[PDB]
Amino acid sequence: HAHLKSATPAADSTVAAPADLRLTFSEGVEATFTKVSLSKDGTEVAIKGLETPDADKKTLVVTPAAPLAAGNYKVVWNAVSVDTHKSNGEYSFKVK
Ligand SMILES: [Cu+2]
Ligand SMILES: [Y+3]
C-alpha cells in the first residue's frame, strides 16, 4: 500500500504558487491507474498530466493545465501502487 509520506506544497502550509504538485509515497505508484482531484476554494482545478519521473516511481508529479491562483486548495488522491494495492487520502494547502 502506498501511503503519502510528504507532498509539495506541504499539507497545511502557505506558499507562493508552485509549478506543480509533488506527492511522495511509501511505495512506487502507477500514473495510469492513479487518480487525483484538485480544487480551489471548493471549485475543480484542471490537471493536464500525471507522471512518475523517477526509476523508483515514489514521486507523483501533478501538472495543472494553468498556473495556480491564490487560494485554499484541496488535494484528493487515489493511488495504485506497484504492489497492486489501492490507497487514498486528502490534504489541503494555501497559495498566498
Ligand atoms: Cu499493499
Ligand atoms: Y469536471
The Å distance, Cα 36 to ligand 2 centre, comes to 12
- Resolution to 1 decimal, in Å? 2.0
Pairing between β-strand 35-40 and β-strand 43-44 as defined by DSSP bridges: antiparallel
Per the structure, the count of domains in the chain is 1
Task: Give the torsion sign (CA, 36, 72, 43, 18).
Answer: negative
Amino acid occupying residue 25: F
Residue 96: HSE in the Cβ half-sphere, 13 Å Cα cutoff: 5
Which grid coordinates are listed for 15? 506558499
> How many angstroms is it from 70 CA to the middle of ligand 1?
36
Do β-strands 71-80 and 35-40 pair in parallel, antiparallel, or remain unpaired? antiparallel
Solving technique for this entry?
Answer: X-ray
Which residue range is the domain that position 34 belongs to? Answer: 1-96
Residues within 5 Å of ion ligand 2 by Cβ? 44
Q: How far apart are CA 37 and CA 76, in angstroms?
A: 5
Write out the E strands in the chain. 4-8, 14-15, 21-25, 35-40, 43-44, 47-51, 59-64, 71-80, 86-95
